[PDB]
């Protein structure tokens, strides 16, 4: 069974284990094979694997990486995924000179919201949306991947006392230390990735939780009870916060038209209750003319 794969090359490494690009020796199918090593006396199957597998096989969608198989031997657990060519981080990096074409950015942000809308409608938070967890193939498709941190929220998901989402993409509510995650923190992350594709640079590259919070404040203005009922009551909010003013959005993201700016400002909205949903983002005018360019991928 595991005999029928030929390993072609390592394409991923992590605390989780390794991922190889592999070839099915019998069908020829090209696959991304994730290998996890098991602690067979004191851990068993890791929680992130339990969650990735069981959630991922509920989410069948073209914009969500496809889990093709699970192999569970004595000591090894293998996840078999569909192979994609490149993550969005390496493409954004390869494109820092020329920039990513606006048509292609629109395509990707349209697709990502489709995969995300599908997660949230099946009560799944992703919670780790960042450029190198998004995958692209050569036909212009982009898919959500790495559901290690994903949670079902049919019952409300409580916030890790020690945080989760990588800091640059982490949402204000989390930094200010609210009690629960909501779908909105996935949207926030997606806003940041949006901006970052437009401007070639991370929107809020914070050095620490507090520095993150402030970089945000300096671009979006410091939230008060009008812009966000309740902010001043949140656990990690201090009244000793400097009041910055809301930067004008045509300066924050120049290359964007009136629609691109409107959408982004709705994704970066302070009050999560008011932050635009992914289902709604897809209805936005910005996407009226959307298309499916294909990237030039320097493999």
């Amino acid at each position: 069974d595991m005999e029928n794969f030929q390993k072609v090359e390592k394409i991923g490494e992590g605390t989780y284990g390794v991922v190889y690009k592999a070839r099915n020796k019998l069908t020829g199918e090209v696959v991304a094979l994730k290998k996890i090593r098991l602690d067979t006396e004191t851990e068993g199957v890791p929680s992130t694997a339990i969650r990735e597998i069981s959630l991922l096989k509920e989410l069948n969608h073209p914009n969500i990486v496809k889990l093709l198989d699970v192999i569970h031997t004595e000591n090894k657990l293998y996840l078999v995924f569909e192979f994609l060519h490149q993550d969005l981080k390496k493409f954004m990096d390869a494109s820092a000179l020329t920039g990513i074409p606006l048509p292609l950015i629109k395509s990707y942000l349209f697709q990502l919201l489709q995969g995300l809308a599908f997660c949230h409608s099946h009560r799944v938070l992703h919670r780790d949306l960042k450029p190198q967890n998004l995958l692209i193939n050569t036909e212009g498709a982009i898919k959500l991947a790495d559901f290690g941190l994903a949670r079902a929220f049919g019952v409300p998901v409580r916030t890790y006392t020690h945080e989760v989402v990588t800091l640059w993409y982490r949402a204000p509510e989390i930094l200010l230390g609210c009690k629960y995650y909501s779908t909105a923190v996935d949207i926030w992350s997606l806003g940041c990735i949006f901006a970052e594709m437009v401007t070639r640079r991370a929107l809020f590259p914070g050095d620490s939780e507090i520095d993150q919070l402030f970089r945000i404040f300096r671009t979006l203005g410091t939230p008060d009870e009008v812009v966000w009922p309740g902010v001043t009551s949140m656990p990690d909010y201090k009244p000793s916060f400097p009041k910055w003013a809301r930067q004008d959005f045509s300066k924050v993201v120049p290359p964007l038209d009136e629609d691109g700016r409107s959408l982004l400002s709705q994704m970066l909205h302070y009050d999560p209750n008011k932050r635009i949903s992914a289902k709604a983002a897809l209805a936005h005018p910005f996407f009226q003319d959307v298309t499916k360019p294909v990237p030039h991928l320097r493999l």
Partner: protein
């Protein structure tokens, strides 16, 4: 959120698929509804010792019932199944689950670390890694949003009834989670405030007081008899002040159906 309705519809879809064989116990050669009740009552205790979420308890019972639906298990191994179920539910639901060592401790070294991890593998295989099952808990959480005034004794009492339902495979194995939650929410609401299953939830679920009646009749029966039940861990748990001592509340003498 904005998906509230999308998710309810999906939960309703899923609960029909993640459903265990209602008659599996008759086909099971060596164990018994009473053995299962003793088991579930033990899982409640474990949950109190290790401070696990109610959702974890519900998921664990789902796992056990689906697993017993297709595998014969002897008396001496039923607890090993339940232990691996609790462990799996913890990994899925808890922010961080107890480690395996701690589940071996509360089985009292009747089983080994090795055995429990072996059983974890087998339960995963038998359930084909499908662990995100709908629970009474998830439906009660949806229904709670439809309290015009939210009332904490009603929420605790509803949770209490839902949890009692986990003890007795007969009758409850034949009801769906969304329906048990319905009966549990109405009965709690009626006991504490006198209000009834609200119109908005009739619209949301399509459940009428009339259609809940059968499950509602059973749940009332269980509620009335709970002090006489051989299994008491749930009543003990729900006299805690974190649950407002609701299990000491007097059940209504009659519904009004």
């Amino acid at each position: 959120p904005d998906y509230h309705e999308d998710i309810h519809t999906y939960l309703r879809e899923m609960e029909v698929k993640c459903k265990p064989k209602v008659g599996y116990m008759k086909k099971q050669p060596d164990i018994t509804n009473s053995m299962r009740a003793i088991l579930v009552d033990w899982l409640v205790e474990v949950g109190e010792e290790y401070k696990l979420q109610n959702e974890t308890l519900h998921l664990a019972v789902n796992y056990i019932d689906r697993f017993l639906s297709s595998m014969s298990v002897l008396r001496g191994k039923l607890q090993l199944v339940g232990t691996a179920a609790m462990l799996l539910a913890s990994k899925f639901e808890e922010i961080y689950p107890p480690e395996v060592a701690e589940f071996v401790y509360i089985t009292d070294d009747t089983y080994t670390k090795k055995q429990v991890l072996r059983m974890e593998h087998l339960v995963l295989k038998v359930l084909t890694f499908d662990l995100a099952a709908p629970t009474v808990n998830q439906f009660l959480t949806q229904y709670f949003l439809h309290q015009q005034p939210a009332n904490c004794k009603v929420e605790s009492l509803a949770m209490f009834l839902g949890e009692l339902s986990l003890i007795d495979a007969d009758p409850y194995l034949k009801y769906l989670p969304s329906v048990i939650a319905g009966a549990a929410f109405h009965l709690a609401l009626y006991t504490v405030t006198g209000q009834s299953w609200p119109e908005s939830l009739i619209r949301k679920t399509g459940y009428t007081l009339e259609s809940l009646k059968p499950c509602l009749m059973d749940l009332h029966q269980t509620y009335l008899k709970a002090p006489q039940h051989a299994q008491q861990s749930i009543r003990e748990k729900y006299k805690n002040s974190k649950y407002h001592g609701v299990s000491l509340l007097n059940p209504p003498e009659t519904l009004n159906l």
